[PDB]
């Protein structure tokens, strides 16, 4: 019935269900336009779909938890590509050719003792 | 227009035009306008004399420019001639709230002089 | 650390559980909106008659093995140096070196 993908970009884990039909996307019981608002957050969701040009073919039910704006928006882009990974099989090579499949494991690193912020040392004056 | 001491600034919002009165800041200026029935967005220039007339008497409920400076100078004089601690700090021109004078307190002491 | 100072801490402990576990009404019970006559003024006056040793205000909370006033740790009860001397040897259970 349904097909699934997770997405886990930068401490925000999503979950996407892809339904054949028309083109409508509901995320966390809200519409796509009103949840994000940022033009770099409602196209990055769309980027996997426009590349395969299905866009108007799939009905999406989405719940996203944790993270921020671009973290969640990036996470969805991961899950959608993973959702598309399931119910079609010959599409992997093209989808991977534009990213969307690499998890992009870049997290915030430690503060570190002796360092002021995370890599910045305090000002060093010799005398 | 013309309030207790003087109200020079036209072309400014009324809520922020009365702030030029020595004793009216922002929370009181907001209060006085509401008490007199005048909104905040309305400019002082647009105000017909049927409004500023009530403004020249509303400020009489708060001590203002005409007397506020006399009281503060009297307030400081009482401590200065008393001989108490805060009088001594005023006498020498040093901080009176008990803070650092070892390095800071340029505002109270004055410009950096060797 | 200067055994004189160590004896102060237990003298102030002894007078801390002796009074301010029972003679707390004056500073807690008779402080609020109630009969506003001199009985409250008696409570304020009578609280000073007790010795200077109050419960929180005069406890330095020093280490248990050396009596070091500074660097205390409330959880282990030792200073910041005895914790590493009651060490990674294994005296403290489940306390290993952290790396995250």
């Amino acid at each position: 019935n349904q097909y699934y993908g997770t997405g886990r970009r930068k401490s925000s884990a999503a979950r996407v269900f892809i339904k054949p039909g028309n083109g409508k996307i509901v995320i966390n019981q809200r519409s796509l336009e009103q949840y994000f608002g940022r033009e770099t957050a409602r196209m990055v969701v769309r980027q996997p779909l426009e590349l395969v040009d299905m866009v108007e073919k799939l009905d999406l039910y989405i719940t996203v938890k944790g993270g921020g704006i671009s973290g969640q928006a990036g996470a969805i882009r991961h899950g959608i590509t993973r959702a598309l990974m399931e119910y079609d099989e010959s599409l992997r090579s093209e989808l991977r050719k534009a990213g969307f499949v690499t998890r992009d494991a870049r997290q915030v690193e430690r503060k570190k003792v002796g360092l002021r912020k995370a890599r910045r040392r305090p000002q060093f004056s010799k005398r | 227009a013309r309030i207790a001491g003087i109200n020079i600034p036209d072309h400014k919002h009324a809520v922020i035009a009365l702030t030029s009165i020595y004793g009216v800041g922002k929370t009181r200026s907001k209060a006085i306008l509401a008490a007199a029935g005048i909104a905040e967005d309305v400019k002082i220039s647009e105000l017909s004399e049927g409004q500023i007339d009530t403004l020249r008497d509303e400020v009489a409920k708060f001590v203002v420019e005409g007397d506020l400076r006399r009281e503060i100078s009297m307030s400081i004089k009482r401590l200065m001639d008393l001989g108490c601690y805060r009088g001594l700090r005023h006498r020498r021109g040093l901080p009176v709230r008990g803070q650092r004078t070892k390095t800071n307190a340029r505002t109270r002491k004055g410009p950096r002089k060797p | 650390a200067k055994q004189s100072m160590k004896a102060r801490e237990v003298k102030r402990v002894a007078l801390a559980d002796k009074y301010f576990a029972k003679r707390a009404e004056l500073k807690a019970i008779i402080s609020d909106v109630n009969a506003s006559d001199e009985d409250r003024w008696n409570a304020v006056l009578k609280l000073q008659t007790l010795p200077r040793d109050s419960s929180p205000s005069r406890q330095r909370n020093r280490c248990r093995q050396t009596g070091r006033p500074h660097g205390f740790l409330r959880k282990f009860g030792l200073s910041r140096i005895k914790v590493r001397e009651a060490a990674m040897r294994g005296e403290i259970p489940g306390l290993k070196k952290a790396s995250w």
Binding site: - | - | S31, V44, L45, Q48, T49
Partner: protein, 80 residues
């Protein structure tokens, strides 16, 4: 005692000492080591002596000095 809910403060030893003085009025200066106590209007006209750390200096009471704590009128550290 730094709140109206608690009430103005004076030490018990000072409070009983001043009560005896007013019973006989002005007398020899009162020597006291208390500096944390407010000034009550019952000791106007006395010349109590506070201890700044090395010596007892006599502070003359006046109606104006009725809300300030006793130590205010004894400079504890000298300078020039």
């Amino acid at each position: 005692m730094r709140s109206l809910k608690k009430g103005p403060f004076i030490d018990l030893h000072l409070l009983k000492k001043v009560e005896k003085a007013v019973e006989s009025g002005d007398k020899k200066p009162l020597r006291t080591w208390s500096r944390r106590s407010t000034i009550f209007p019952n000791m106007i006209g006395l010349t109590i002596a506070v201890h700044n750390g090395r010596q007892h200096v006599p502070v003359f009471v006046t109606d104006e000095m009725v809300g300030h704590k006793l130590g205010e009128f004894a400079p504890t550290r000298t300078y020039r």
